[PDB]
């Protein structure tokens, strides 16, 4: 599968990230069992990435583009849209489905 987006709290419902814009987010990343492997909130610093530059996994590129500014959403990302068969040594195991709690704070 690809990326599923399930809303957590609504944004403005009007402003959606376009290619080339910088997305400012807080996020928590968990394995399918629920184990957290990464979180911007634990560092108390929002994460910024430029949409369309493949600075993040494909599930983020396509999933965050579906979110409106101010929305919080749950992205469930299959391995093909994620770290794939290889994964990430000691962080994300092979063929892992990932769950991301993502809040789109603003666009720059």
From Swiss-Prot:
Originating species: Homo sapiens
Reaction(s) the record says it catalyses: [protein]-peptidylproline (omega=180) = [protein]-peptidylproline (omega=0)
Keywords noted in UniProt: Acetylation, Cytoplasm, Isomerase, Membrane, Rotamase, Sarcoplasmic reticulum
First-level EC class: isomerase
Domain of life: Eukaryota
Gene3D superfamilies linked to this entry: 3.10.50.40
Family the UniProt entry places it in: Belongs to the FKBP-type PPIase family. FKBP1 subfamily.
Membrane topology: Peripheral membrane protein
PROSITE patterns found in the cross-reference section: FKBP_PPIASE
Pfam families: FKBP_C (PF00254)
Residue numbers bearing the N6-acetyllysine modification: 53
GO molecular function: activin receptor binding; calcium channel regulator activity; FK506 binding; I-SMAD binding; macrolide binding; peptidyl-prolyl cis-trans isomerase activity; signaling receptor inhibitor activity; transforming growth factor beta receptor binding
Known regulation of activity: Inhibited by both FK506 and rapamycin.
The PPIase FKBP-type domain, residue ranges: 20-108
Gene (UniProt): FKBP1A
Protein known as: Peptidyl-prolyl cis-trans isomerase FKBP1A
CC per GO annotation: cytoplasm; cytoplasmic side of membrane; cytosol; membrane; ryanodine receptor complex; sarcoplasmic reticulum; sarcoplasmic reticulum membrane; terminal cisterna
Binding partners and assembly: Interacts with TGFBR1; prevents TGFBR1 phosphorylation by TGFBR2 and stabilizes it in the inactive conformation. Interacts with ACVR1B and SMAD7. Identified in a complex composed of RYR1, PDE4D, PKA, FKBP1A and protein phosphatase 1 (PP1). Interacts directly with RYR2 and RYR3. Interacts with GLMN; rapamycin and FK506 abolish the interaction with GLMN in a dose dependent manner. Interacts directly with RYR1.
PANTHER family associated with the record: PEPTIDYL-PROLYL CIS-TRANS ISOMERASE, PEPTIDYL-PROLYL CIS-TRANS ISOMERASE FKBP1A-RELATED
Record field: transmembrane: none
